[PDB]
Amino acid sequence: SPVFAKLLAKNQASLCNTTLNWHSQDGAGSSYLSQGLRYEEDKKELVVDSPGLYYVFLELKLSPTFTHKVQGWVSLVLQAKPQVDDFDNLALTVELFPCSMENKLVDRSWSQLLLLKAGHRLSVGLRAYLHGAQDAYRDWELSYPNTTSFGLFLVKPDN
Amino acid sequence: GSPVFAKLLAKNQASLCNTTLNWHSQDGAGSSYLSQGLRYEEDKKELVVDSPGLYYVFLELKLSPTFTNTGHKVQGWVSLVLQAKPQVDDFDNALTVELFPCSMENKLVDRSWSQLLLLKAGHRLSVGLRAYLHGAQDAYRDWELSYPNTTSFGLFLVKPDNPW
Amino acid sequence: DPVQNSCDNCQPGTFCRKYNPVCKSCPPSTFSSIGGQPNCNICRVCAGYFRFKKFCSSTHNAECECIEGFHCLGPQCTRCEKDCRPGQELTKQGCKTCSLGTFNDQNGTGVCRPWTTEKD
Amino acid sequence: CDNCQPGTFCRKYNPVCKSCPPSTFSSIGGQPNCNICRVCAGYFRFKKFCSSTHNAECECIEGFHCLGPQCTRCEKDCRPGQELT
Ligand SMILES: *[C@@H]1O[C@H](CO)[C@@H](O[C@@H]2O[C@H](CO)[C@@H](O[C@@H]3O[C@H](CO)[C@@H](O)[C@H](O)[C@@H]3O)[C@H](O)[C@H]2NC(C)=O)[C@H](O)[C@H]1NC(C)=O
Numbered sequence A: 001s002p003v004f005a006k007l008l009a010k011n012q013a014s015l016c017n018t019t020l021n022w023h024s025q026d027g028a029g030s031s032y033l034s035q036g037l038r039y040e041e042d043k044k045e046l047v048v049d050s051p052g053l054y055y056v057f058l059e060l061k062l063s064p065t066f067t068h069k070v071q072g073w074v075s076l077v078l079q080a081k082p083q084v085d086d087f088d089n090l091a092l093t094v095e096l097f098p099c100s101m102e103n104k105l106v107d108r109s110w111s112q113l114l115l116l117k118a119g120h121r122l123s124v125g126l127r128a129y130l131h132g133a134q135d136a137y138r139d140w141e142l143s144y145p146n147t148t149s150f151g152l153f154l155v156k157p158d159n
Numbered sequence B: 001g002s003p004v005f006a007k008l009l010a011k012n013q014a015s016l017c018n019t020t021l022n023w024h025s026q027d028g029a030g031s032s033y034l035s036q037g038l039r040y041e042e043d044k045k046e047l048v049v050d051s052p053g054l055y056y057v058f059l060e061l062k063l064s065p066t067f068t069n070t071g072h073k074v075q076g077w078v079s080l081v082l083q084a085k086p087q088v089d090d091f092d093n094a095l096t097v098e099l100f101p102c103s104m105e106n107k108l109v110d111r112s113w114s115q116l117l118l119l120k121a122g123h124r125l126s127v128g129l130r131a132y133l134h135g136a137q138d139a140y141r142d143w144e145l146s147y148p149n150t151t152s153f154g155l156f157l158v159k160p161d162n163p164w
Numbered sequence C: 001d002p003v004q005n006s007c008d009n010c011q012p013g014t015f016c017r018k019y020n021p022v023c024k025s026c027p028p029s030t031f032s033s034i035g036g037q038p039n040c041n042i043c044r045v046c047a048g049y050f051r052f053k054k055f056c057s058s059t060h061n062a063e064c065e066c067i068e069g070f071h072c073l074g075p076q077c078t079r080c081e082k083d084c085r086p087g088q089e090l091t092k093q094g095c096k097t098c099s100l101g102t103f104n105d106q107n108g109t110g111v112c113r114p115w116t117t118e119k120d
Numbered sequence D: 001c002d003n004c005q006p007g008t009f010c011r012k013y014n015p016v017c018k019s020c021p022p023s024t025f026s027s028i029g030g031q032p033n034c035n036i037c038r039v040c041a042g043y044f045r046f047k048k049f050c051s052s053t054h055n056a057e058c059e060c061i062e063g064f065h066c067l068g069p070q071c072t073r074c075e076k077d078c079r080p081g082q083e084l085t
């Protein structure tokens, strides 16, 4: 059977420097968690049971809250335990400009083919830096209902 | 059996025409990947699915401005449309990006699309590039498909109809 | 009396799959106001400029309002706008300057009348 | 694998020096994949066409000049008079 997961960000609007929580249970929107995986709510980690080459993806969805130029960046960082050699290029980063507020949704994707070991723990960190106004961080939020997502697929199992 | 996965990259495209896109599918053609149970017919610009089941199909559109003059306001939209030859049922009727006069301040304008679709055996899939740009006499030339961060298209078999 | 093996026979606060009807309760922080939809909807979160009016439950979404000094814009309060200054009034499309020969002397409250855009 | 010449791609798991697919290039060789060729259209015109060892290189159509390291944008010509116009 295929190994696939697509989790949706849980209870996050504000652009904090925090480890995101995810909807993984069946019926939690379009969230899906196949048989070869599990999500540890208390540790905010996706546990991979079988080793192999995984296509890991992140999708960041942001929306303006206000209707004052506000600029900066928002980031989704894949946090692997144990670490995968590539630590640098494992982050989805969106740059925001005063122009960006003209869009109802600012969407950006990240995808990477990664070799994962058995019992691999994966979590996602939310990072942001916004300036330009006293209310800079409040001017952008993680989009609703088109929710920020995180998932993976087993492309080639090891042998 | 073995997992079914594809990630194709847009082949020889910059200009924003109204045609069906070509894709890199050969091993060693950038990050392009084509597993077993999948074929790419270059002459028909179609991805052929061998096994039926529920497929997670995705599109990623990457655009970049070509001009420097900020004085001439360019607006419009660019779209990537999934074309199914054996045909499929759709809940949402295409990846569409809106461009504004100030979008030119961004080195890259990126947007993604994903959908879980029931595909039949021998399903033919192709992608159409659509665009409507106005605001200047050179509207069409002011945006191009980004290079080297290339527009991509792929899928993966989430649940086969015959899993066992 | 309703006893049939169907997702039509299920209550709000549940999700149900047509192929094998079971009516599972909504996962935490998800809701369903109608019973027997294939999934529950993710709850809206009210933070920053937005504050809660209604909190999320298994049968209803959270509803937002804007923090003091700001008001809602949009059907489901999708954006916040700063409360009007004198010389303006609150309308459908938000804070709008009072017309030819009209003025509003109040800050952030009130409707303007004809007898500067803020005084006389 | 890396010892491979330009115009090839090689993978560590089974080292073979395969030539670059049709519309791709590799100026190094040791790389696990070949790089996709740039296309010069609209404001951009070809200088160098793509080969297995070099990317296509763009220039701008007459009346316009390149801006950026790899000619990523085109700017309208001003004048060569040196009269600050
Ligand atoms: C969340 O963490 C990020 C780091 O990932 C924090 O961003 C950093 O914030 C500081 C100010 O708080 C920025 O420093 C500024 O640097 C400029 C240099 O151009 C200087 O002129 C300023 O005086 C100031 O020191 C810094 O640039 C930025 N990080 C990066 C890498 O750009 C952020 O503040 C954290 N957010 C929260 C919620 O606290």
Ligand SMILES: *[C@@H]1O[C@H](CO)[C@@H](O[C@@H]2O[C@H](CO)[C@@H](O[C@@H]3O[C@H](CO)[C@@H](O)[C@H](O)[C@@H]3O)[C@H](O)[C@H]2NC(C)=O)[C@H](O)[C@H]1NC(C)=O
Pocket: B016, B017, B018, B130, B131, B132
């Ligand atoms: C590629 O195909 C698209 C359709 O998917 C073409 O876009 C359409 O272009 C026409 C004009 O060329 C637009 O019509 C204009 O409409 C406005 C207001 O509706 C009106 O003021 C004008 O007089 C004019 O009729 C039309 O809006 C647009 N399509 C859409 C989405 O509505 C496009 O022209 C094609 N591009 C190429 C490469 O030819």
